[PDB]
Every structure is written in C-alpha cells, then in structure tokens.
Amino acid sequence: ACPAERSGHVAVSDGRHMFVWGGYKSFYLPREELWIYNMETGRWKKINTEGDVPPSMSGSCAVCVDRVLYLFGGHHSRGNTNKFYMLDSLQWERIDCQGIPPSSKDKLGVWVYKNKLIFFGGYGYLPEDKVLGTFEFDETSFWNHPRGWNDHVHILDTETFTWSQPITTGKAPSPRAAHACATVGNRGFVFGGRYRDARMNDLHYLNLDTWEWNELIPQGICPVGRSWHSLTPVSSDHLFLFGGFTTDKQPLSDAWTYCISKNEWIQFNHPYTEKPRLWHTACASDEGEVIVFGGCANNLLVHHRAAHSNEILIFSV
C-alpha cells in the first residue's frame, strides 16, 4: 500500500496522521482517494471518499483544524477555482460561503488563527475589483484566459463561513505564488515565492491580531530565493524550511530553520542532500519530526522529463 507519485498535492496533519490528497504527475491523481500516513508506524492507508468530492486538482490550499480538513482553491483540468470544501475525518462537503470569495487561484498559502482561516496570495484569474489588494498579470499567460499573481488577504470565518478582507497596515509583500506560509501564535509568516521574473528570498509576517505587515531582515546568511518550498512550524520559536526551486531553475535540497527569537537562519544538516524536492509537502509530527512527501526531484517545467516522487523524507529536528 503506497500512494502514487505526485507534486502539487496537499498534506495536512494532526501530529499523528498525515492526510494526503490530489496533485498531478507525468495527469491529475484520482479525486476520490484520500491517503493517510501514520507518522508513528510508517504505514499508509487509502480510503475512498464520497459527498461533494472536489475535482482532481494541483495547487489547492488545505488545513487540518480539530480533525476537520478544509480545502480551498487549486487547478483542475478546466482551470483555477475558488470553491471551498470541508472533510470531517468519508464525506466531502462543498460549503457555499457568504461574502465575496477570493478570486479563483492556486499555489497560495493559509494561516489558521482561532476561528479564522486566512489566505494569502496565489496565481489565477483576474478578480472582480471588489477585492482589495493588488493583482499583476503574468504576461506569458496571454500566449497560453490570462492569469497573474495577487497579494490579497482573505478571511474565511469558520463561525459563519463568511468571507471578508481585513484592512491591513504596513507594507504587504509583493503579489506572489508558490510562497510558503507558516503560523506561530498570532504571526502569519510568509517566505519567498515567485513574482514576475524572480523566485524570492524575502521574509514577512502579518500580525493576525492587529493586521499589521512586518518585513523581517535576518542578520547574516539567508537561504537562496525560491518557490515551491515548504516552511513548517516545529516549535513556538522555529520554522523549518526545505527544498524548492531557484530563479535559475535549480532544484533544492538544503534545509534550514528560522529561529524567530534570534531572527536568524540556521542551515540544517541532513542525509537527503541528493534528494532535492519541489512542490512537495511537509508536516510536523508530535515527536519533533518533519515528514516530507511527494514533489519533484528536477525541473518539473520540462514535463516529459519530470521526476515526481512518492518518497517520504523524515527530518529529525
């Protein structure tokens, strides 16, 4: 029993069980399958789901909150979506939310704070200008509906399933997609991502109480700019970064922790230097490990040469 290889899937966790859904490979993986990885025993189980099963998608944005799985956005065979689903862990339910939803998009991030799911950025269609924030077209998408990056922040209030947008202060990060978000306390961190012609190395956080954006400028050596990397809270003071894809299209296998209190990056030694990954997933276990799954070992933009993986990589940190 083992899930097929894939990139752009989602993985979420309760610290013990890792739930894996979707993604594509060299196209989309079966929509009705939900793969569960037991972090303690190392075994996989597959279960088939029912209800309002979402279309097979890559680049969806998922979270696990009290064993309830929430899923937003993604890219299916007919384009991007802004649908919102939940799965209480065998039956998917599509939730018809109130308020103005975000624009249809994929490759974004989410912070969880109390009752709120807070989504940021991503890549998709031109919004209705009702949305506030900025959207910038990817000029090359006109040559293959045009799409672009956004820096939007949206709240889905799980108390009422109503969409809204906070008024924020400070300088938001530029629009971006394939960035990584991580939450610690009331701070929603975001690192790197793709915007225009760069895969970036900037680090910000949004205060989830005051809605104030802050840019972090760590002292000393910082990880190379990248997208399609993972960033994972592993303590109340450390974010674990792995892998990704550079501006110059290099697949990455370096691992770092960002120490929040010291505002310092620390490069992490590990046995997987020859196993670079991008568009993988990463989940923190209760025993201090980061469980990496899936993703692609080389440049996935060369589709016929793409090396998608179904390997589990375990980082003990």
Partner: peptide, 7 residues
C-alpha cells in the same frame, strides 16, 4: 503545462 504556470 497550466498547473505549474506562475510558480
């Protein structure tokens, strides 16, 4: 291919 555009 369209799913990986924009990253």
């Amino acid at each position: 291919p369209p799913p990986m555009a924009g990253g």
